[PDB]
Amino acid sequence: HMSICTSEEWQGLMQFTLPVRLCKEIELFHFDIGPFENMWPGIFVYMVHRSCGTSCFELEKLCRFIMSVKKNYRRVPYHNWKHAVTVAHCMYAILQNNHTLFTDLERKGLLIACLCHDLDHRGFSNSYLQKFDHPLAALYSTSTMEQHHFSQTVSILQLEGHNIFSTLSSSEYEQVLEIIRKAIIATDLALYFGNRKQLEEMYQTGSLNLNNQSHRDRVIGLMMTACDLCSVTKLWPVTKLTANDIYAEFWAEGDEMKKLGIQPIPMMDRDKKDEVPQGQLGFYNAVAIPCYTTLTQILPPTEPLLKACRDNLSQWEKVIRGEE
Ligand SMILES: COc1ccc(Cc2nccc3cc(OC)c(OC)cc23)cc1OC
Ligand SMILES: [Mg+2]
Numbered sequence: 123h124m125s126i127c128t129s130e131e132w133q134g135l136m137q138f139t140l141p142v143r144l145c146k147e148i149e150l151f152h153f154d155i156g157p158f159e160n161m162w163p164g165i166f167v168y169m170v171h172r173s174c175g176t177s178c179f180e181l182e183k184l185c186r187f188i189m190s191v192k193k194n195y196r197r198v199p200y201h202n203w204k205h206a207v208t209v210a211h212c213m214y215a216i217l218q219n220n221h222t223l224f225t226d227l228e229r230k231g232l233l234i235a236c237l238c239h240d241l242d243h244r245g246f247s248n249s250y251l252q253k254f255d256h257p258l259a260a261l262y263s264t265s266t267m268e269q270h271h272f273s274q275t276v277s278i279l280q281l282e283g284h285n286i287f288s289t290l291s292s293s294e295y296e297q298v299l300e301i302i303r304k305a306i307i308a309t310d311l312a313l314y315f316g317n318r319k320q321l322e323e324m325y326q327t328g329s330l331n332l333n334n335q336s337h338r339d340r341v342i343g344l345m346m347t348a349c350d351l352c353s354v355t356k357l358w359p360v361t362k363l364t365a366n367d368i369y370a371e372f373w374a375e376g377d378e379m380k381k382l383g384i385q386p387i388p389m390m391d392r393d394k395k396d397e398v399p400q401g402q403l404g405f406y407n408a409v410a411i412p413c414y415t416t417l418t419q420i421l422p423p424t425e426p427l428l429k430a431c432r433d434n435l436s437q438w439e440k441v442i443r444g445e446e
């Protein structure tokens with residue numbers, strides 16, 4: 123049920139060279155990948171090499187992998203190939219400022235996790251797939267979509283010549299799939315609120331410890347929520363532009379709920395755009411700020427993310443007060 127990349131596609135990626143100007147700019151949090159669509163695959167490859175070594179993965183294997191990842195993301199408004207790389211770069215940005223705090227294995231897994239975390243999404247939320255009993259909801263009772271993503275990841279590794287993790291030892295191999303699974307599942311916002319509430323308490327009482335595997339999985343968890351939202355952390359014209367993509371998707375869903383005679387939440391109701399600036403402020407306050415605030419206290423060199431998020435809150439507040 124997968125899509126293998128054509129034999130010409132992955133060959134071009136190996137021939138790729140990143141322009142010097144980008145290399146320095148990538149390192150920044152607020153960096154936006156948007157202007158460089160055809161350069162995206164080579165941008166990931168570059169982030170890997172710089173974080174794991176130019177010889178960590180067989181290069182021929184990474185290229186079949188990456189291009190098979192792109193070819194297995196759907197053409198939906200938001201949960202698409204662009205989201206993959208965007209979310210992967212915020213990871214690489216958090217990693218670079220926190221390099222030693224994570225192991226060679228973790229870092230390998232976290233970058234593959236991000237790129238894959240959203241694999242083959244259909245622009246339909248869990249709410250929908252459970253609520254109206256889709257197959258995927260029956261197979262995966264909770265975190266329905268997340269678990270399909272992880273499975274799709276593994277399906278791609280199983281493809282002939284795609285398994286970039288071959289050279290890893292069987293102990294490490296299974297270890298990295300558990301890092302990846304946990305990470306992909308962590309992106310379910312359902313799980314987010316438990317996570318942030320816990321990590322906050324573990325910090326305030328000084329009881330956090332990075333060598334405590336339980337704690338470890340949760341910090342990784344929050345990094346996953348930070349990377350996943352990170353369009354809330356770019357310059358406002360980019361942020362707003364992505365918001366259009368987000369709602370494009372919600373509204374396509376609400377239309378289906380309407381069709382089956384169920385009033386979709388204001389948020390997915392296209393005939394309710396006036397309430398949007400409200401919802402965003404609600405979401406920034408409830409989710410984003412807390413998310414980045416904790417992740418800062420835990421990882422101080424990520425604070426630029428929390429600053430950008432506040433800037434984007436002022437803008438939304440400004441929209442509400444009729445200044446746009
Ligand atoms: C269920 O699907 C999503 C989950 C999370 C997001 C991330 C996101 N980014 C910016 C603003 C957001 C604002 C939200 O509430 C209004 C929200 O709902 C959970 C998610 C938001 C987008 C999504 O769009 C498809
Ligand atoms: Mg997701």
Ligand SMILES: [Zn+2]
Pocket residue numbers: 205209239240309350
């Ligand atoms: Zn995502």
